[PDB]
Structure 1
Amino acid sequence: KENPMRELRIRKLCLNICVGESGDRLTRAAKVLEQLTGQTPVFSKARYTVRSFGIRRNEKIAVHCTVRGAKAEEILEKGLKVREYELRKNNFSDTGNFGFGIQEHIDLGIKYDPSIGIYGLDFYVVLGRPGFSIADKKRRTGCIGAKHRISKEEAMRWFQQKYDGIILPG
């Protein structure tokens, strides 16, 4: 038997739509994540001014959304479906997470709206394990130890075991 406390699970599904825009194109991309997840997504202000991009210091560039537990498993089921249950070798982080993208949100389960428009958006599966909430406390914190960590090799075989995801190189 393997230990049932090494149960590799999803912590959060980090979504964001970085439009490089404020006002009207951004505040209607906020409605996209709230139709998608069913929770009020946080707007992201700029780091500093890059004049080439069309951003500026403390300008709302993006709108991000963290989904936990029962909902995130079901939205990551919606989103992998858009990527016909397949991801690449490069797509998985060395820290043991993986993510992907989708070019338009119509393929998720939202119908085309003429007024609101189209928005491609980011999926990043933050894979965790019971005892990963040590490292972000106020009380006695600590690093999670080397054996307990999720590797790149481990996240790929998990996704292949869970979603039957055919992983292909390049």
Structure 2
Amino acid sequence: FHEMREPRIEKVVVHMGIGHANAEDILGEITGQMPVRTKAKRTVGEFDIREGDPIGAKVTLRDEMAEEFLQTALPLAELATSQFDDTGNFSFGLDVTVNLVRPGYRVAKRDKASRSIPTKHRLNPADAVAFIESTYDVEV
């Protein structure tokens, strides 16, 4: 019952929403893998008229690349209760988001016979706080 219910880290999305780049380099070195350009939608008066064009960059970390990042990333922030999602996620910091979920999440990410994860099987803020707090740090 528990083994297939205990939380895990699906992805850690590190991103820097600049606005016009040279910052890709630092994300690459701090994460361990290639970055991705970030285009934008809708024209803005703040000299942001160009629709499709570099504005930010991100990196989605999975498995070891994520843990090996968080081991030195988490100690750089003071996690808060409010800083938590309703699905059991949290974003701190250059932004660093951590997507948490249970074992059978593939059911909602696959092509064939996909299905949305029932609320009961969805992670909670509390259940999330516990799992992470239960790994080198403190809550509140």
Shared fold, TM over 0.5: yes
Rounded to whole Å, the distance in 1 between the matches of 2:40 and 2:80 is: 30
Residue 163 of structure 1: how far off its partner (Å): 2.4
Residue 125 of structure 1: how far off its partner (Å): 0.6
Residue 146 of structure 1: how far off its partner (Å): 2.1
Corresponding residue for residue 104 of structure 1: none
Q: Which runs of 4+ in 1 moved over 4 A?
A: none
Q: Is the 8 A contact 1:15 1:124 kept in 2?
A: yes
AA of the residue aligned to 2:11: K
What aligned pairs does 1:9-158 form with structure 2 within 5 A after superposition? 9-21=8-20, 26=21, 28-52=22-46, 54-56=47-49, 57-83=51-77, 86-101=78-93, 121-158=94-131
Q: Is the 8 A contact 2:14 2:97 kept in 1?
A: yes
Rounded to whole Å, the distance in 2 between the matches of 1:125 and 1:43 is: 20
Q: Is the 8 A contact 2:129 2:139 kept in 1?
A: no
AA of the residue aligned to 1:63: A
* DSSP 3-state at the match of 1:60: coil
Identity among equivalent positions (%) equals: 37
* DSSP 3-state at the match of 1:50: coil
TM-score (norm 1): 0.77
Residue 139 of structure 1: how far off its partner (Å): 0.7
TM-score (norm 2): 0.92
Render the CA deviation track for 1:54-76: whole Å, top value 9, x for unaligned.
32311211011100001101211
Stretch deviating more after TM superposition (134-143 or 153-162):
153-162
Corresponding residue for residue 161 of structure 1: 134
